[model samples]
Target: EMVDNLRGKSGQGYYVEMTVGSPPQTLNILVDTGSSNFAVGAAPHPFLHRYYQRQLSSTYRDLRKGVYVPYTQGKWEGELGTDLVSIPHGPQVTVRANIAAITESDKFFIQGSNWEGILGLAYAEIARPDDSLEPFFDSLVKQTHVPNLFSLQLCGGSMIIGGIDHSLYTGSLWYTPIRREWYYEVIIVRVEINGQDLKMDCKEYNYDKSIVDSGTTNLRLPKKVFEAAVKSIKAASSTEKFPDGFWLGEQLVCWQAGTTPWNIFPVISLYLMGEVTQQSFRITILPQQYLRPVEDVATSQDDCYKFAISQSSTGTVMGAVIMEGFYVVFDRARKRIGFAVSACHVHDEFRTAAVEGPFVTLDMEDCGYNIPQT
Candidate 1:
């Protein structure tokens, strides 16, 4: 239980305590990055989609077998089902969570499969848009000031606290660069490698208008844009006969060529929605040799491996590697988000931290989650 600031919080999350029976069970659950709805191992429903939506009423349909989550490269299938969830964090509370099975439309949701279920923070936002998570934390704050604190250290492995820590950041926090009716809006100023500008050729992209998602794991550039960068970097090295998507390894050869009595330089820089750009080693995010080379494609190497762009559900994932050691704060009161680049790194490039903006109107008319307490 941790509670200090209410609406204008910086880096913290609301935690729930769940338990069952005499022995008691404890589970440390973090409110989802966005979409405030709580989920446990026990989501009640007739079915679960790949993205994990439950159908409790007749109006909600289970489109598991129909929907799809595609990326620029690969895709998988699954179904939806139900399971039990328990909250052992609270003093003596028995909370049952809903569970769902993966369906065809699931894989398009996220990057990793670490948690059993998601505990969405959107419940308060969507269920009661007029009311925030403040009231819920307020109730626990009555018990002790500590219960209202929530914190998540994205990559640098910091701490997401219900309170603030001055020693965590340096300069100022960057504000949301764009405005849109949907989630959070952003822009990619530019992507550079070792001081050289990378080519970006996408008409659909404002390059100035985009979305910032902490839930994704990789930088998803437009197909043409991504290829241009890869080609520019591979300009020097001898072109190798490799599969399509396995270019990470191909780029490695080019980078190594720049060294070893060669000038193999592997460095990249990304400019966010603002003019802010961070210069660092290329391997800072993805290893120079992270991609594998394959020779199975019968036709040209074009059909071998698939490039990671936007095919299935992977499209929504901008990737977590780009957001390493960064603090992302959402201000509902201000209706904006603050992205603070931190000073630590996590080995897991696949896991990202995303902050979802509230819906257009915070409409909660028919949205209500009823979990009886005993």
Candidate 2:
């Protein structure tokens, strides 16, 4: 995992804080650039809870008395409301935010992720289910008459804000071509593993018709691929390390120092969306340690994943980790998606870039770390 680094010039995003009941208690939240909704802590809506109609086709739910948000694995139940979220740079800018006062969650908050809410950039409209919680940034940009563009400097401790680096947003935004599906979804063209071809057909990827969601945290894959990844890595390992998975849980993957190379450079390529596809020369794949151990995983009698997999019968899910610093475009106006690679960070090679009339210098550091074997 990457550590927190220094920040340069940044456009302040709306910082959202969590509040409980009428008095407001303390809670934590995450800055999600991939999503566009704001949620915090709340008890419950007194009026809207009874009057609103459920958007059946859409995923929005009023929940009557319970304010619960369904995720990939579990549900978060609590009261949800809107608040004026501010990033607290110089001043506070209010955005119509949704705050969910969670009473239950399967995952506990660690130091970095402790919070009651998450700032979602996935879809503005879907953030909150009622008028009280509408898309704040969408209206803010329109009213302010500025480029609705936003940039995420994750390495620099910067989150989404109202504006973009003027220079980065100066020229016409280059839109990457994508297939006719969701806003940022691209169709699959191919998949390769560690320079060696897996021989999986393209149609397999089209299963579940997966989308390249920039917001997702983990690199979700089909159960078979995940199984293959673990089995293959385990076979190549010099040391047998199934202590955690095989004993405590049914998981069978382990990480050994000698096997790092095989994991990191596990030559693989996956094509998606239209012409917008990813092909790797020598990409870094995390050791089994970087992922969930097998012990914690419950499997079926047939050695299949207990949890249902979404992608097609043969497809896999690639999360944000693989798309780090990858330039992706989501054009709602034209209803198209695009992709392109930005200049890679180079050491000592400074590039002069401008933002809001100020010249900004960019540099890079060789900050690779030995991935902890999972």
Candidate 3:
């Protein structure tokens, strides 16, 4: 399994490297939990340049089944094939995984994007054509060379496939059962802003369909819920203001901070379904972490912050902003996701050691980890 460092781009997405085909063509693909179709070169014009050539791989097998995958902007249509997909790290596990070579795409895909394709982390149910093919992880788990698990630490940390790394996080692992296998769908019993629970109509909000996805950059919430949430934040810190406050657009709600967020903002929480009522897990978003500042912004006190947005949708998505502060475990075997408070900053020793070897034990010391700088 590959334990590669996640590369972040445009503050909205992350990509990981994977080798495909028999001769091993390396492609940096977006690791998305929101979609399931894994294809390469969907862009129009010179799209043929970045695609997986079926003729290049000696082990490639053409299934001849056509597939169409929908995106936020448009759809991607392609032919499906099977090839030796290799996760290039550790012992470098290679398996016969389904590959889609997109022949047509819409404006949703940029003309010359950096990513070659998207590697879907969601289940086979969300997969195209209703279970005709399995994902890379599904094929991997059946062989049982590695455990049926994977972990993501949004930014520069590793995407630990088949196991959790103790060095990446701290605290006890809290689990929330997946309501649906399609996505990492979890039931949200409560959404609190500054300790005040928001009024939610289940039929209107569709909180039960909420999911934790690494692919999505912002927390896409229901319209009413988001409106109420921003109001609470504004009310909590009346003195401080944002250069870019309120709803930036339909999809984003950001704040260009006038004051240090840690000194003014309030913590938010989302209560997820757990084993028992008392055992319910709540994902906490700290002021500094959730209210992230723009890296390139020219500010005196480093006070630019961005909040999650509201969307017209049937479900809510907890994206990279929230996931970065936690160690997320996608456990397929038990059909549940685990969360643990992360130490954010990676240790120098662990970082150096990881690059020196093919694989390392995930069960490392959980104590004495340093916190992130504000």
Candidate 4:
């Protein structure tokens, strides 16, 4: 179940079409889980349309050193390598990845480009130029044993890897207990809006870390949880106005293409810390998933919009406009990180990106998170 060719995609995302070396080549990975590094594009990039020909592979290796990575806004110089991959469809296995070859980049190759790299799926303490890299789904879950879990159906651009097809997610599957593994990290405790109580303190939404980033594209918050979420969207109702440059995303608000002002915008809860403990749950997103729509900034009457949330400093990322409304698992040997309700948000017949649960009852030190060392 893989089919994303948005050609280089935007704000980063949706891709997968494997095959590498030993008589097979096809690329276009970009299926990030945020910060790991499985890169590609071995040089020559004008927003890349296809690359990764390390001499046409022959079990290539070259793993010496030469990386850069960076992010929060592009950077990718590389050289370390390895090869022999091949997964022409879900877990067809063939193992031996962990490359990086990308010869250079900045602003990380934006543009309507298509694919040719990036397939990290997190773990290995955020592997990179250091940390003894081993991603690429931990060598495809130790070369073909499969089922350490992996799931994501971003608008059905599908990606199952080893389990969880349950019809691309539905009903309750709310999880949350991976307080850290470098970054699939979780544990929020509280922060709601159309349900109230962002009364602060839950360590300010886990202080500085709350991962689950599908290569990011908004839903960031953490400047005091984005100033109490714009003071609860300016105390809702009476038409909770909008200015201050549309919540500081550099403003952008057109309307006419069917007047999508999104019914006065407001739903956005989040309260993780369930399952492995004292309880908390409640994942929501619905202002039609972070309120977005700007298809070529429409015309005949305008119709733009972009305030998918953002304001972190070094933490909080549920990205991809809140994982494009659910269907994200990433079990990774039972560390936990589920969330259902995404067959592209109940296909409109209405179920709205919600994963509800645990109905409150936390304080076990309100979940976890450390990061303070040097």
TM-scores for every predicted model:
0.48, 0.54, 0.80, 0.35
Give the top-scoring candidate (lDDT). 4
> What is the TM-score (0 to 1) of candidate 1?
0.48
lDDT of every model, 2 decimals = 0.35, 0.37, 0.66, 0.74
lDDT (Cα, 0-100) at 348 in candidate 3: 27
Show where candidate 1 strays beyond 4 Å. 1-37, 43-114, 120-152, 156-164, 170-172, 199-209, 236-243, 248-265, 275-317, 346-374
Model 3 residue pairs with clashes: 90-358
What is the Cα-based lDDT of residue 73 in candidate 4?
A: 73
Q: Lowest summed lDDT over 10 consecutive residues: which window, candidate 3?
A: 350-359
Runs of candidate 2 with Cα error greater than 4 angstroms are 1-28, 33-37, 42-66, 89-93, 101-112, 124-133, 153-157, 160-183, 224-265, 275-316, 325-374
Number of colliding residue pairs in model 2 = 35
Which numbered prediction scores highest in TM-score against the true structure? 3
Q: Give the Cα error of residue 180 in candidate 2, in Å.
A: 6.5
Q: Report the CA-based lDDT of candidate 4 relative to the real structure.
A: 0.74
lDDT tens per residue, model 3, 68-176: 8886545778888888887675336778888888788775454444566788878887888667578767887775588888888765657888888888777677787
The lDDT ranking, best first, is 4, 3, 2, 1
lDDT value, candidate 1, whole model: 0.35
lDDT tens digits, residues 1-374, model 4?
A: 43332232225567778877877888867787887878888878777777888897888888888888888877888888888887677766688887888888878866664666777788878787677888888888787888888887675257777788787666878778786677788878888788888776676777677888888878887787887787787676336466888778787777667766565667778888787567777877877666666567235477777777878888788887677757888897988889887765632434366777767564556534464333
Please write out the lDDT profile of model 2 over residues 1-374, one tens digit for every residue: 11121132111111233332222233344544444445543323321121111221132333344454554433455654433343444113333334444555544222223234555555443344433454545654554543444444322333334333332222233343434322234444444444344444444454444455534444556554555544544455435444434422344333342232323323234434332223211122332212322222333222221111122242344454443433334544455443333232111222211111111112121111111121
